[PDB]
Amino acid sequence: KETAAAKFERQHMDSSTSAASSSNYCNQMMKSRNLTKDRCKPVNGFVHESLADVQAVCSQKNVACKNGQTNCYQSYSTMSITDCRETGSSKYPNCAYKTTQANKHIIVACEGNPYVPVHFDASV
Ligand SMILES: [Cl-]
Ligand SMILES: [Cl-]
Ligand SMILES: [Cl-]
Numbered sequence: 001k002e003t004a005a006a007k008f009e010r011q012h013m014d015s016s017t018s019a020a021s022s023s024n025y026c027n028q029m030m031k032s033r034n035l036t037k038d039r040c041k042p043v044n045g046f047v048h049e050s051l052a053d054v055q056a057v058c059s060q061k062n063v064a065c066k067n068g069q070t071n072c073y074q075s076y077s078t079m080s081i082t083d084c085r086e087t088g089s090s091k092y093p094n095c096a097y098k099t100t101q102a103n104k105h106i107i108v109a110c111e112g113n114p115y116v117p118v119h120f121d122a123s124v
Contacts, residue, residue, distance in 0.1 A: 004111065004118040011035065012120060013054065014046040019080050019101050026084035026097035040086050040095035045120060047106060048080035054117060058110035065121050071109050072121050078103045081123055 002010070010033055020026070035041040047054055057075045065072035083100045090096040105124045108117040 005116050008108075008117050008119065009051070011044060012047055013051060014048055014082070015050050018048055020046075020082040020099050023099050025082060025101075026099040027095070029082075030084055030095060030097055036093070036095040040090055040092045042086045044084045045123060046082045046084065048082065053079070054106070054108075055114075057106065057108055058115050058117060063107065065107075065109055069109070071111060072107055073110060074107045074124070075105045078105055081106065083123070 014029065029046060030036050030041065030044065035044060057073050059073075060076050061074045062070065063072050063074050064070055080103055081101075083102065084097045085100070087096050087098050102123075107121040107123065109119040109121060110116055111118045
């Protein structure tokens with residue numbers, strides 16, 4: 001099985017680009033990361049920062065998670081992100097996504113040792 005940390009990296013990290021340049025970014029990335037394999041994952045965001053910067057959020061502002069747990073952290077600064085969301089049209093296996101690029105703070109749940117991001121909570 002994939003570890004939680006590895007899964008977070010595969011689904012959410014894209015340090016290779018500074019921002020999504022095309023409206024087709026999500027369609028390509030969702031496919032490349034194998035997120036459209038058995039179904040179309042409906043929502044998924046990509047962070048365009050280095051892995052080290054994202055991991056460093058686990059030592060930033062501690063906040064409650066939407067679930068009430070307290071292992072969530074919000075980034076002190078805004079980061080480049082791309083939100084991918086399935087369009088009302090979209091039908092597996094013809095996955096189609098809307099790409100929305102933005103700069104905002106991210107909120108992640110961290111766990112383990114080393115203590116790293118394992119889940120996204122939100123972005124703001
Ligand atoms: Cl790992
Ligand atoms: Cl994979
Ligand atoms: Cl997400």
